Chain A
Amino acid sequence: LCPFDEVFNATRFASVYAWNRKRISNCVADYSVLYNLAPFFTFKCYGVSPTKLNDLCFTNVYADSFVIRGDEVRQIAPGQTGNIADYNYKLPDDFTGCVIAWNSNKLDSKVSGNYNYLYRLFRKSNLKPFERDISTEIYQAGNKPCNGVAGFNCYFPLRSYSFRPTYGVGHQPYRVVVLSFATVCG
């Protein structure tokens, strides 16, 4: 078929600031069975309809996977603004694919706080659609120059999630898969 188990059932997910990008091509994909039988927390399609994705064919498909905050799943959508949309993962206003998310508090959570997932807190400007910033360096606040080390107005642009089982659904980790849309057919 098509390697969707390698995306949705991956043992580990990337952080939102360094989201993965898997190119899907030369496969037959049954979107209908995935939508109908897999119980995700969210399955929203914007430019297409989930129930009729099989009759469509695309030259290439991208699958982006990352882990974000519970109430940050709101801004994985066209036209949304916020921390994630501006600085971590911007989605085009004419996005045509689908956004899939599910709660992963049973895996990405630790009693001592899981710091393995980072998100970009500070940036000079908003992200372009489907672009990422892997390189991390000290951000200048105010007007004073920075020497390359954190200080009074010099911050590490990467802030760590601290997922714990008792944070509640607002702060619990959510694994998000974004599918972007004639070698791929249903």
Chain B
Amino acid sequence: QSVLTQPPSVSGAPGQRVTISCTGSSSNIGAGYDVHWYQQLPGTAPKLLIYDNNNRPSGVPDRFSGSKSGTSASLAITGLQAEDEADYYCQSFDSSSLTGSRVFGGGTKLTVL
């Protein structure tokens, strides 16, 4: 099991908004640490998608957005194209150890109806 938890799967119709949630413990997200999101298309390595709370790397369309509130973080996708059908992983830094740790989410499979 993982410290950060995500819904196993989400679904939405093309062109419709979808939101993926990520909640943490008193440490990591609850301790003010930033949350990063990664996209893993089938048969490929994960790709950085949201490098800080509501921050986005170059080459990522503006339809991807994120937010953080308390011990929870969320990823929202405004539209819904065909290519938005990958696994999305929540990530954060967990400080409940001597040298620190970096915790991943459980992975959310997004399907386009």
Question: Which residues of A pack against B, CB within 8 Å?
Answer: 70-71, 74-75, 82, 166, 168-170
> Is B100 part of the contact surface with A, judged by Cβ < 8 Å?
yes
Chain B facing A: main interface SS: loop
Of the listed stretches B1-9, B26-34, B59-67, B83-91, chain A binds B26-34
The one of B33, B97, B98, B99 that contacts A71, using a Cβ cutoff of 8 Å: B33
Residues of chain A contacted by B21 (CB below 8 angstroms): none
Whose C-beta in chain A lies nearest to the C-beta of B101? Answer: A169
B96 within 8 A of A: yes
CB–CB B27/A170 < 8 A? yes
Are B31 and A168 in touch, CB under 8 angstroms? Answer: no
- Give the A-B pair count, Cβ closer than 8 A: 25
B residues with CB within 8 A of A = 27, 31-33, 95-100
Closest to B34 in A: A74
Q: Which residue of A lies closest to B32 (CB)?
A: A74
Name A's interface SS. Answer: loop
A170 to B100, CA, bound (A): 8
A82 to B30, CA, bound (A): 12
Q: Are B98 and A168 in contact (CB under 8 A)?
A: yes
Chain B residues whose C-beta falls within 8 Å of the C-beta of A82 in the assembled complex: 32
B32 touches A169 (CB 8 A): no
Residues in A whose Cβ lies below 8 Å from that of B32: 71, 74-75, 82
Which residues on A sit within 8 Å (CB–CB) of B95? 70-71, 168-170
What residues on B are CB-neighbors of A70 within 8 Å? Answer: 95
A-B contact pairs, 11 of them (CB 8 A): A71-B27, A71-B32, A71-B95, A82-B32, A166-B98, A168-B95, A168-B96, A168-B97, A168-B98, A169-B98, A170-B27
CA distance A166 to B27 in the complex (A): 16
Contacts of B100 in A (CB 8 A): 169
